[PDB]
Amino acid sequence: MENFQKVEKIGEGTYGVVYKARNKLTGEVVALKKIRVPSTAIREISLLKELNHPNIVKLLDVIHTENKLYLVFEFLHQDLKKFMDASALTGIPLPLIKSYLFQLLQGLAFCHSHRVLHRDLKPQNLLINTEGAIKLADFGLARPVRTYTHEVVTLWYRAPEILLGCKYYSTAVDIWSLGCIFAEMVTRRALFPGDSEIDQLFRIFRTLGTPDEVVWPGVTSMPDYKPSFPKWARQDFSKVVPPLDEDGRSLLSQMLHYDPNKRISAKAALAHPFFQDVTKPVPHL
Numbered sequence: 001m002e003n004f005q006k007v008e009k010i011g012e013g014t015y016g017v018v019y020k021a022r023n024k025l026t027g028e029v030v031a032l033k034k035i036r037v038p039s040t041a042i043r044e045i046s047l048l049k050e051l052n053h054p055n056i057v058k059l060l061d062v063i064h065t066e067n068k069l070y071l072v073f074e075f076l077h078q079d080l081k082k083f084m085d086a087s088a089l090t091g092i093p094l095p096l097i098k099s100y101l102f103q104l105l106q107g108l109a110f111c112h113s114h115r116v117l118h119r120d121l122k123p124q125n126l127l128i129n130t131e132g133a134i135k136l137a138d139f140g141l142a143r144p145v146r147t148y149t150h151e152v153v154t155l156w157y158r159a160p161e162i163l164l165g166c167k168y169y170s171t172a173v174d175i176w177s178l179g180c181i182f183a184e185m186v187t188r189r190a191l192f193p194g195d196s197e198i199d200q201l202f203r204i205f206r207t208l209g210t211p212d213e214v215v216w217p218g219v220t221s222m223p224d225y226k227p228s229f230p231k232w233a234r235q236d237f238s239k240v241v242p243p244l245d246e247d248g249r250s251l252l253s254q255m256l257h258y259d260p261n262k263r264i265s266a267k268a269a270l271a272h273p274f275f276q277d278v279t280k281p282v283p284h285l
């Protein structure tokens with residue numbers, strides 16, 4: 001750590017506090033995360049230093065000293081959450097929303113091709129720069145209910161299979177989360193703001209319809225599925241994300257399919273007609 005000087009507190013991350021810091025030597029400005037060490041952790045983390053992509057926050061170095069773990073990441077000046085809030089009254093322009101979704105799908109396609117899942121995608125761990133790029137952060141660190149600061153972990157972006165107690169979820173969980181983020185960027189309001197696991201599940205059911213064996217084979221046998229779940233009817237996406245166009249609604253619907261196996265893959269989503277006219281606009285930061 002002596003090689004680093006803490007500039008400011010970036011925020012209380014899920015696995016520890018994060019500080020903007022400078023390499024007392026290289027002058028490099030980075031994001032320093034102190035992880036709240038098992039050999040299994042070290043090996044997995046070392047594997048992440050290899051997962052390099054333009055849309056994945058670069059893990060610069062892993063420091064294992066004094067039996068403590070520090071992760072040094074590339075530094076970006078803001079997360080998507082702050083940007084969405086700052087664009088609340090005007091709304092993020094569609095071309096930029098399209099650009100961000102496109103880039104994130106590229107990042108996911110990359111990770112997923114390497115069999116790596118994010119598992120906890122949310123606006124707070126999506127970082128943007130002044131150039132128009134957006135990157136996935138804290139990728140692979142998943143493999144708690146509260147943070148080290150007791151802060152509640154958001155359930156708003158959790159896939160239904162996870163909520164239903166699935167133990168071996170797939171890359172499909174990341175597509176679901178991104179779909180929820182996509183919808184939020186368009187409407188300027190969280191799609192499923194649950195404040196408990198059951199409230200989260202029921203919010204999803206109230207919008208997409210209570211899942212059954214027809215739309216999701218095997219759902220009634222899932223760990224936490226209850227035959228007593230209320231049966232709500234499905235609503236039109238025309239009502240869910242106006243004024244998103246049909247290409248956009250088509251894509252969002254495929255990203256929010258109940259059956260993880262039916263849910264569109266990142267790579268297939270990249271070929272969706274919605275991205276026919278994709279561009280890379282510069283954000284107003």
Ligand SMILES: Cc1ccc(N(CC#N)c2cc(Nc3ccc(OC[C@H](O)CN(C)C)cc3)ncn2)c(Br)c1
Pocket residue numbers: 010011012013014018031033057073074075076077078079081082124125126127137138139
């Ligand atoms: C909650 C949290 C804490 C740390 C990070 N990590 C780690 C990784 N991987 C960063 C951040 C960063 N830059 C930056 C990120 C946020 C930020 O402000 C966050 C505020 O908390 C905004 N909120 C209102 C959402 C300022 C600079 N550059 C590289 N890595 C992330 Br992702 C989320």
